[PDB]
Short mmCIF file of C-alpha atoms in Angstrom, two decimals:
data_model
loop_
_atom_site.label_atom_id
_atom_site.label_comp_id
_atom_site.label_asym_id
_atom_site.label_seq_id
_atom_site.Cartn_x
_atom_site.Cartn_y
_atom_site.Cartn_z
CA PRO A 1 4.88 -33.76 37.29
CA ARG A 2 3.86 -30.28 37.98
CA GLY A 3 -0.01 -29.38 36.28
CA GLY A 4 -0.46 -29.30 32.62
CA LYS A 5 -1.05 -25.85 31.29
CA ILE A 6 -3.74 -24.50 28.95
CA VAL A 7 -1.93 -24.09 25.87
CA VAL A 8 -2.62 -20.79 23.60
CA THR A 9 -1.43 -20.14 20.22
CA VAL A 10 -0.27 -16.86 18.52
CA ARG A 11 0.18 -16.43 14.96
CA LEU A 12 2.25 -13.86 13.72
CA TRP A 13 4.60 -13.16 10.74
CA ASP A 14 7.26 -11.43 11.75
CA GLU A 15 10.43 -12.78 13.00
CA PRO A 16 11.82 -10.32 15.53
CA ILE A 17 8.50 -9.56 16.76
CA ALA A 18 7.85 -13.14 17.00
CA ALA A 19 11.31 -12.95 19.46
CA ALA A 20 10.13 -10.33 21.27
CA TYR A 21 6.60 -12.45 22.23
CA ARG A 22 8.49 -15.03 23.16
CA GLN A 23 10.05 -12.43 25.86
CA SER A 24 6.75 -11.27 26.58
CA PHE A 25 4.92 -14.47 27.33
CA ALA A 26 7.72 -16.21 29.51
CA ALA A 27 6.70 -12.96 31.95
CA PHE A 28 3.19 -13.25 31.16
CA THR A 29 3.47 -17.24 32.22
CA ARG A 30 5.40 -16.53 35.30
CA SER A 31 2.55 -14.30 36.86
CA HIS A 32 -0.37 -16.57 35.17
CA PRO A 33 1.39 -19.79 35.61
CA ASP A 34 -2.21 -22.06 34.31
CA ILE A 35 -1.58 -20.60 30.97
CA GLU A 36 1.80 -21.49 28.52
CA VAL A 37 1.70 -19.56 25.36
CA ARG A 38 3.54 -20.72 21.81
CA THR A 39 4.03 -18.34 18.75
CA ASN A 40 3.49 -19.77 15.51
CA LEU A 41 5.50 -17.29 12.70
CA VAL A 42 4.28 -18.04 8.98
CA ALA A 43 6.14 -16.09 6.20
CA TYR A 44 4.37 -13.22 5.23
CA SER A 45 3.62 -13.84 1.96
CA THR A 46 1.59 -16.72 2.17
CA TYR A 47 -0.16 -15.10 5.72
CA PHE A 48 -3.51 -14.39 4.90
CA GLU A 49 -4.33 -17.19 2.07
CA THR A 50 -3.27 -20.01 4.92
CA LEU A 51 -5.14 -18.11 7.38
CA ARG A 52 -7.85 -18.14 5.31
CA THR A 53 -7.78 -21.76 4.90
CA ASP A 54 -7.05 -22.54 8.61
CA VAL A 55 -9.35 -20.68 9.84
CA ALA A 56 -12.10 -21.87 7.65
CA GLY A 57 -10.77 -25.10 8.26
CA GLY A 58 -11.20 -25.00 12.18
CA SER A 59 -7.18 -25.28 12.30
CA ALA A 60 -6.00 -21.69 13.00
CA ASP A 61 -4.54 -20.59 16.03
CA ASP A 62 -6.47 -18.91 19.13
CA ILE A 63 -4.78 -15.50 18.70
CA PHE A 64 -3.60 -14.38 15.14
CA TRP A 65 -2.66 -11.18 13.96
CA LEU A 66 -4.90 -9.17 10.66
CA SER A 67 -3.81 -6.00 8.98
CA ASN A 68 -6.66 -3.62 7.90
CA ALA A 69 -7.10 -5.01 4.75
CA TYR A 70 -7.92 -8.28 5.34
CA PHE A 71 -9.49 -8.03 8.86
CA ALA A 72 -13.61 -7.24 7.80
CA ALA A 73 -14.10 -10.78 6.04
CA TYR A 74 -13.19 -12.47 9.14
CA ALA A 75 -15.21 -9.85 11.55
CA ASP A 76 -18.68 -9.94 8.99
CA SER A 77 -17.94 -13.69 9.54
CA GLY A 78 -18.27 -14.06 13.44
CA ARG A 79 -14.79 -15.30 13.29
CA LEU A 80 -13.57 -12.90 15.55
CA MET A 81 -14.05 -11.91 19.30
CA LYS A 82 -15.61 -8.73 19.73
CA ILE A 83 -12.82 -6.80 21.80
CA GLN A 84 -14.62 -5.76 24.83
CA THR A 85 -13.00 -2.98 26.99
CA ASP A 86 -12.27 0.71 27.07
CA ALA A 87 -9.86 1.82 24.19
CA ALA A 88 -8.36 4.86 25.85
CA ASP A 89 -4.70 3.59 26.43
CA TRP A 90 -4.69 2.39 22.31
CA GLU A 91 -3.28 4.18 19.62
CA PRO A 92 -6.33 5.90 17.77
CA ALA A 93 -4.98 5.36 14.37
CA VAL A 94 -4.80 1.65 14.99
CA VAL A 95 -8.62 1.31 16.92
CA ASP A 96 -9.62 2.82 13.73
CA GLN A 97 -8.63 0.41 11.44
CA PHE A 98 -10.04 -2.41 13.13
CA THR A 99 -13.39 -0.85 13.67
CA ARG A 100 -16.52 -2.25 11.67
CA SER A 101 -19.87 -2.32 12.11
CA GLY A 102 -19.29 -0.40 15.59
CA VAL A 103 -17.22 -2.86 17.08
CA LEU A 104 -13.61 -3.40 18.04
CA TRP A 105 -12.03 -6.41 16.50
CA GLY A 106 -8.32 -6.65 17.50
CA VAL A 107 -6.23 -5.73 20.56
CA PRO A 108 -3.74 -3.36 18.85
CA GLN A 109 -0.51 -4.45 19.02
CA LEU A 110 2.02 -2.18 16.72
CA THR A 111 1.87 1.24 14.89
CA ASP A 112 4.11 2.71 11.77
CA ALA A 113 3.27 6.04 13.23
CA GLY A 114 3.25 8.84 11.09
CA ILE A 115 5.74 10.15 8.48
CA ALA A 116 8.86 12.92 9.12
CA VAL A 117 11.20 14.97 7.66
CA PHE A 118 14.76 13.93 8.55
CA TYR A 119 17.13 16.55 8.40
CA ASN A 120 21.17 17.21 8.18
CA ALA A 121 21.31 20.17 10.72
CA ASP A 122 24.71 21.29 9.28
CA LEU A 123 23.37 21.77 5.83
CA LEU A 124 20.38 24.08 7.49
CA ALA A 125 23.09 26.07 9.11
CA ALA A 126 25.40 26.79 5.99
CA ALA A 127 21.95 27.98 4.43
CA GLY A 128 21.02 29.49 7.33
CA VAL A 129 18.21 27.80 8.24
CA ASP A 130 17.37 26.99 12.17
CA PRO A 131 15.77 23.82 12.29
CA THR A 132 12.46 25.41 14.26
CA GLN A 133 11.50 26.68 10.50
CA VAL A 134 11.25 23.16 8.79
CA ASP A 135 8.14 22.23 11.06
CA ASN A 136 6.55 25.66 10.01
CA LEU A 137 6.42 24.40 6.26
CA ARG A 138 3.68 24.39 3.87
CA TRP A 139 3.41 23.11 -0.02
CA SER A 140 0.79 24.19 -1.85
CA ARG A 141 -0.18 24.69 -5.95
CA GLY A 142 -0.80 28.34 -4.83
CA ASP A 143 0.78 31.34 -4.02
CA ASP A 144 0.93 30.50 0.11
CA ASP A 145 3.35 27.50 -0.83
CA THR A 146 6.47 27.93 1.57
CA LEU A 147 8.06 24.70 0.93
CA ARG A 148 9.67 25.65 -2.75
CA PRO A 149 11.42 28.07 -1.31
CA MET A 150 12.85 26.32 1.03
CA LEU A 151 13.98 23.34 -0.64
CA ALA A 152 16.12 25.72 -3.45
CA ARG A 153 17.91 27.71 -0.66
CA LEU A 154 18.81 23.67 0.00
CA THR A 155 19.79 22.66 -2.90
CA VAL A 156 23.11 23.62 -4.33
CA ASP A 157 25.39 23.12 -7.80
CA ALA A 158 29.21 22.58 -7.78
CA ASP A 159 29.55 26.21 -8.49
CA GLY A 160 27.88 27.07 -5.42
CA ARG A 161 24.48 28.25 -7.03
CA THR A 162 21.43 27.58 -5.46
CA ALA A 163 18.43 26.16 -7.68
CA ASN A 164 16.34 29.67 -6.66
CA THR A 165 19.96 31.34 -8.51
CA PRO A 166 20.19 32.49 -12.17
CA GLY A 167 22.70 30.51 -13.45
CA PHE A 168 22.36 27.37 -11.76
CA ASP A 169 23.28 23.89 -13.24
CA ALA A 170 21.00 21.50 -12.14
CA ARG A 171 23.31 18.98 -14.45
CA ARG A 172 25.87 19.52 -11.75
CA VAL A 173 23.67 19.29 -8.72
CA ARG A 174 26.06 18.24 -5.36
CA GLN A 175 23.42 18.54 -2.56
CA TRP A 176 19.66 18.33 -3.02
CA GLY A 177 17.09 19.81 -0.96
CA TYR A 178 14.69 16.97 -0.44
CA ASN A 179 13.25 13.70 -1.19
CA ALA A 180 10.11 13.79 -3.54
CA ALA A 181 10.22 10.63 -5.48
CA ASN A 182 8.08 7.98 -6.78
CA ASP A 183 7.62 6.47 -3.31
CA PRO A 184 4.41 5.75 -1.80
CA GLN A 185 4.93 5.56 1.49
CA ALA A 186 7.90 8.35 2.10
CA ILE A 187 6.17 10.77 -0.33
CA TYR A 188 3.12 10.06 -2.36
CA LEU A 189 0.93 8.65 -0.38
CA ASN A 190 1.12 11.67 2.06
CA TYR A 191 0.67 14.06 -0.52
CA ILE A 192 -2.72 12.80 -2.09
CA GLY A 193 -3.88 12.67 1.37
CA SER A 194 -2.45 16.15 2.21
CA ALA A 195 -4.86 17.54 -0.61
CA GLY A 196 -7.95 15.44 0.60
CA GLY A 197 -7.50 12.59 -1.95
CA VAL A 198 -7.48 8.83 -1.83
CA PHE A 199 -5.24 6.40 -2.97
CA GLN A 200 -7.54 3.34 -2.50
CA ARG A 201 -11.48 2.71 -2.11
CA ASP A 202 -13.38 -0.57 -1.18
CA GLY A 203 -10.10 -2.56 -2.49
CA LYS A 204 -9.73 -0.85 -6.02
CA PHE A 205 -7.36 1.64 -6.59
CA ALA A 206 -9.16 5.23 -6.88
CA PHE A 207 -6.07 7.54 -7.23
CA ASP A 208 -6.97 9.57 -10.32
CA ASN A 209 -8.83 11.91 -8.54
CA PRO A 210 -8.77 15.74 -8.23
CA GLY A 211 -6.73 15.89 -4.91
CA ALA A 212 -4.21 12.82 -6.17
CA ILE A 213 -3.59 15.69 -9.88
CA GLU A 214 -2.75 18.01 -7.82
CA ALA A 215 -0.48 15.91 -5.25
CA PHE A 216 1.42 14.35 -8.27
CA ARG A 217 1.47 17.76 -10.08
CA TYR A 218 3.66 19.27 -7.26
CA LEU A 219 5.81 16.67 -7.33
CA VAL A 220 6.60 15.87 -10.73
CA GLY A 221 7.10 20.19 -10.55
CA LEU A 222 9.94 19.99 -7.49
CA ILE A 223 11.29 17.40 -9.43
CA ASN A 224 11.66 18.20 -13.19
CA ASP A 225 11.12 21.39 -12.88
CA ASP A 226 12.61 22.79 -9.35
CA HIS A 227 15.46 20.75 -9.49
CA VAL A 228 15.30 20.15 -5.76
CA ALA A 229 14.82 16.46 -5.37
CA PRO A 230 16.96 14.13 -7.64
CA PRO A 231 15.63 13.42 -11.17
CA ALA A 232 13.55 10.68 -11.22
CA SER A 233 15.84 8.29 -13.23
CA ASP A 234 18.05 8.20 -10.06
CA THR A 235 15.12 7.27 -7.92
CA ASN A 236 12.23 5.35 -10.35
CA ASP A 237 13.84 2.00 -9.47
CA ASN A 238 16.29 2.37 -6.74
CA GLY A 239 14.19 2.77 -3.31
CA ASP A 240 17.38 3.64 -1.45
CA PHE A 241 19.10 6.14 -3.23
CA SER A 242 17.66 9.10 -1.50
CA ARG A 243 18.42 7.90 2.07
CA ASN A 244 21.92 7.13 0.62
CA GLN A 245 22.55 10.31 -0.68
CA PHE A 246 21.19 12.08 3.01
CA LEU A 247 23.66 9.54 4.63
CA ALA A 248 26.58 10.72 2.51
CA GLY A 249 25.66 14.14 3.49
CA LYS A 250 24.25 15.55 -0.22
CA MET A 251 20.48 16.27 0.64
CA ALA A 252 19.32 18.29 3.43
CA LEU A 253 15.43 17.37 3.73
CA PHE A 254 14.89 13.36 3.50
CA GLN A 255 11.01 12.78 4.51
CA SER A 256 10.58 8.90 5.67
CA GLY A 257 9.14 6.83 8.51
CA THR A 258 10.44 5.25 11.58
CA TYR A 259 11.99 2.21 9.32
CA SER A 260 14.70 5.03 8.39
CA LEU A 261 15.74 5.44 12.13
CA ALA A 262 18.10 2.83 12.40
CA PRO A 263 20.02 3.02 9.22
CA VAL A 264 20.45 6.91 9.99
CA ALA A 265 21.27 6.20 13.42
CA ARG A 266 23.88 4.09 12.41
CA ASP A 267 25.71 5.75 9.99
CA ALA A 268 25.28 9.56 10.02
CA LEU A 269 27.99 11.39 11.05
CA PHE A 270 26.81 14.94 10.92
CA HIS A 271 24.08 16.50 13.46
CA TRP A 272 20.93 15.50 12.94
CA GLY A 273 17.09 15.90 13.47
CA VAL A 274 13.74 14.89 12.65
CA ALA A 275 10.93 17.93 11.91
CA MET A 276 6.55 17.53 11.22
CA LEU A 277 5.91 16.43 7.90
CA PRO A 278 4.81 19.56 5.75
CA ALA A 279 1.05 20.92 5.88
CA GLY A 280 -0.60 20.69 2.68
CA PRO A 281 -4.17 22.28 1.57
CA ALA A 282 -6.01 19.46 3.97
CA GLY A 283 -3.34 19.82 6.65
CA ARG A 284 -0.68 17.69 7.87
CA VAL A 285 -2.16 14.26 6.28
CA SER A 286 0.52 10.89 6.70
CA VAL A 287 -0.01 7.50 5.87
CA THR A 288 -0.24 5.43 8.81
CA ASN A 289 -0.25 1.15 9.17
CA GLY A 290 -1.35 -0.74 12.30
CA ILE A 291 -1.35 -4.32 13.18
CA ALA A 292 -4.05 -5.74 15.71
CA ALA A 293 -4.36 -9.19 17.24
CA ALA A 294 -7.33 -10.95 17.32
CA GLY A 295 -9.06 -13.57 18.99
CA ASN A 296 -10.31 -16.85 17.46
CA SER A 297 -13.97 -17.44 18.02
CA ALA A 298 -13.74 -20.79 17.62
CA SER A 299 -11.24 -21.90 20.12
CA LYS A 300 -11.51 -24.37 22.65
CA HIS A 301 -10.10 -22.10 25.74
CA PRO A 302 -11.70 -18.79 25.41
CA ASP A 303 -11.38 -17.57 28.40
CA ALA A 304 -7.41 -18.39 28.39
CA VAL A 305 -7.86 -16.58 25.08
CA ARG A 306 -8.96 -13.77 27.16
CA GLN A 307 -6.51 -13.57 29.22
CA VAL A 308 -3.74 -13.55 26.64
CA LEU A 309 -5.33 -10.99 24.99
CA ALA A 310 -5.79 -9.00 27.56
CA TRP A 311 -2.02 -9.01 28.93
CA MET A 312 -1.33 -8.37 24.80
CA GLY A 313 -3.10 -4.93 25.25
CA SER A 314 -1.48 -3.97 28.84
CA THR A 315 1.68 -1.80 29.51
CA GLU A 316 3.92 -4.46 30.55
CA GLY A 317 2.82 -7.42 27.80
CA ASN A 318 3.00 -4.66 24.72
CA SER A 319 6.21 -2.63 26.10
CA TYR A 320 8.34 -5.96 25.07
CA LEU A 321 7.57 -5.15 21.40
CA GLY A 322 9.31 -1.76 21.90
CA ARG A 323 12.23 -2.20 24.05
CA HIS A 324 14.94 -2.87 21.31
CA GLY A 325 13.59 0.03 19.54
CA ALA A 326 12.73 -2.05 16.14
CA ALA A 327 8.79 -1.71 16.47
CA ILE A 328 6.37 0.43 17.44
CA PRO A 329 3.84 -0.25 20.72
CA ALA A 330 0.53 0.43 19.90
CA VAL A 331 -0.32 0.67 23.66
CA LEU A 332 0.42 4.42 24.14
CA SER A 333 1.55 3.51 28.16
CA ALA A 334 3.96 1.05 26.79
CA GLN A 335 5.55 4.14 23.50
CA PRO A 336 7.83 5.47 26.72
CA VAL A 337 10.27 2.37 26.12
CA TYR A 338 10.23 3.00 22.24
CA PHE A 339 10.90 7.38 23.01
CA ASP A 340 13.30 6.40 25.42
CA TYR A 341 15.58 3.84 23.54
CA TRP A 342 15.63 6.06 20.97
CA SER A 343 16.50 9.18 23.47
CA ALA A 344 19.29 7.62 24.94
CA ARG A 345 20.85 7.74 21.36
CA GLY A 346 19.90 11.33 20.76
CA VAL A 347 16.70 11.16 18.77
CA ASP A 348 13.72 12.43 19.57
CA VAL A 349 10.98 10.73 17.67
CA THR A 350 8.50 13.03 18.83
CA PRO A 351 7.43 14.65 14.97
CA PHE A 352 6.86 10.64 14.09
CA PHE A 353 3.96 10.58 16.73
CA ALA A 354 2.30 13.93 16.68
CA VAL A 355 1.40 13.78 13.22
CA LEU A 356 -1.34 11.20 13.89
CA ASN A 357 -3.25 13.59 15.57
CA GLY A 358 -5.08 15.09 12.92
CA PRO A 359 -6.49 13.42 9.37
CA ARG A 360 -4.83 10.15 8.06
CA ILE A 361 -4.68 8.38 5.07
CA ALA A 362 -4.32 4.17 5.33
CA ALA A 363 -1.74 2.43 3.56
CA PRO A 364 -3.11 0.87 0.86
CA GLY A 365 -3.58 -3.37 0.66
CA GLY A 366 -5.28 -6.19 0.15
CA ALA A 367 -5.61 -9.42 -2.08
CA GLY A 368 -4.21 -8.61 -5.35
CA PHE A 369 -3.03 -4.98 -4.67
CA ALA A 370 0.72 -6.39 -5.10
CA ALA A 371 -0.06 -7.34 -8.62
CA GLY A 372 -1.65 -4.13 -9.17
CA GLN A 373 1.13 -2.09 -7.82
CA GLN A 374 3.14 -3.60 -10.05
CA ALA A 375 0.89 -2.48 -13.09
CA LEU A 376 0.82 0.97 -12.12
CA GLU A 377 4.79 1.06 -11.58
CA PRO A 378 5.72 1.70 -14.98
CA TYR A 379 3.02 4.73 -15.86
CA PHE A 380 4.01 5.88 -12.78
CA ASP A 381 7.86 6.03 -13.54
CA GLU A 382 7.18 7.88 -16.81
CA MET A 383 4.87 10.46 -14.86
CA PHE A 384 8.22 10.87 -12.28
CA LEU A 385 10.07 11.64 -15.55
CA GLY A 386 7.93 14.41 -16.68
CA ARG A 387 6.39 12.87 -19.54
CA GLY A 388 2.99 13.54 -20.92
CA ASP A 389 0.61 14.65 -18.52
CA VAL A 390 -0.18 13.73 -14.89
CA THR A 391 -4.16 13.44 -15.65
CA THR A 392 -3.66 10.98 -18.88
CA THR A 393 -1.16 9.15 -16.55
CA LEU A 394 -3.19 8.58 -13.60
CA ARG A 395 -6.40 7.86 -15.94
CA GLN A 396 -4.58 5.29 -17.57
CA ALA A 397 -2.65 3.90 -14.74
CA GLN A 398 -5.83 3.30 -12.42
CA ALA A 399 -7.12 1.17 -14.84
CA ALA A 400 -4.46 -0.62 -15.48
CA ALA A 401 -3.68 -1.52 -11.92
CA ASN A 402 -7.23 -2.30 -11.31
CA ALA A 403 -7.45 -4.36 -14.47
CA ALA A 404 -3.97 -6.54 -12.93
CA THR A 405 -5.79 -6.59 -9.49
CA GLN A 406 -8.81 -8.13 -11.00
CA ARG A 407 -7.48 -10.69 -12.93
CA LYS A 408 -5.36 -12.07 -9.79
CA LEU A 409 -8.35 -12.23 -7.70
CA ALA A 410 -10.05 -14.21 -10.88
CA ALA A 411 -7.29 -16.24 -11.18
CA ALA A 412 -7.25 -17.46 -7.55
CA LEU A 413 -11.49 -17.68 -8.02
CA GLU A 414 -10.64 -20.66 -10.57
#
């Protein structure tokens, strides 16, 4: 029989990406035939709880995915290999999310990239707007704003009147300008970062601050006063509403991430493209998130783990994760396979990546986060419906969100 290979295990939570890794590792083992890599797919819902007990019990895989909201505890407690290499070919946003105490604690694998603005070029042309104009847009609570008049021109009622025109009837809107809504990823986290505010800090909700107040007041205005985005009752409990209106030819600008590329490309019958995120008072600040693979410091085969991590961080190894156009390599030299997948389909994905070259805001998360996000949602729904006031809602919602998180964490300790 042939020689026994050293077996390295890799843990993750995403089924299609697990399938791409299996392809990547088959290629690794052809050139490194002394090592066999096995993937271990564990469901996301219990991933971090099960990792914590496996690592504590000395039964964790050799390599495992981490997110920004959970890596620190592992790094601080010596559970992770230091990643000792230059980071120049790795997405900086992802490197930054796994750097602690001056050390990088995982090999960047995937990025969400940034948020951008899908546009219906036929509706822009109908309004006399060139697609290039959508890259010049600025939102502001002050007189320097240019987003609001653009959105008003792109919002039209059944009689053909735009949102800026006397006699416009918001009850009879047939086409919206935009998708402002109670939507953290596509909308409000970007508005908060673009106003210099935070959403989460040190594991707690922290969105009751001046930057966030400005962001939410602007969004409440777009929806309830300008009528350039759908009423909040259409979007508060219905995360696909705006994408569905965009696909139906009823929305000019649709701000979203690369997660909307596949459904838009599959169904849109009109001419469409992607433009930059609008700049706010602190600049164009997008939400982003990344995933890195950490090496288990307790591995029985550390040299093999280091070889497998070098492969995973390489052009060839990481290209496998992007070649179906469904996930974005964090290795910069591997990103062309994702760009080329999309450009073959007529989509230039540049704006999702260009926005990362600036200030950013992290996607929030962490232990007990889901409980707190669930708690704030009814308060945010009323705010986006134009009821009460932004300041009093944010105060109350933050207290409710933190209380729900803390209960969940207390229940876990006991």
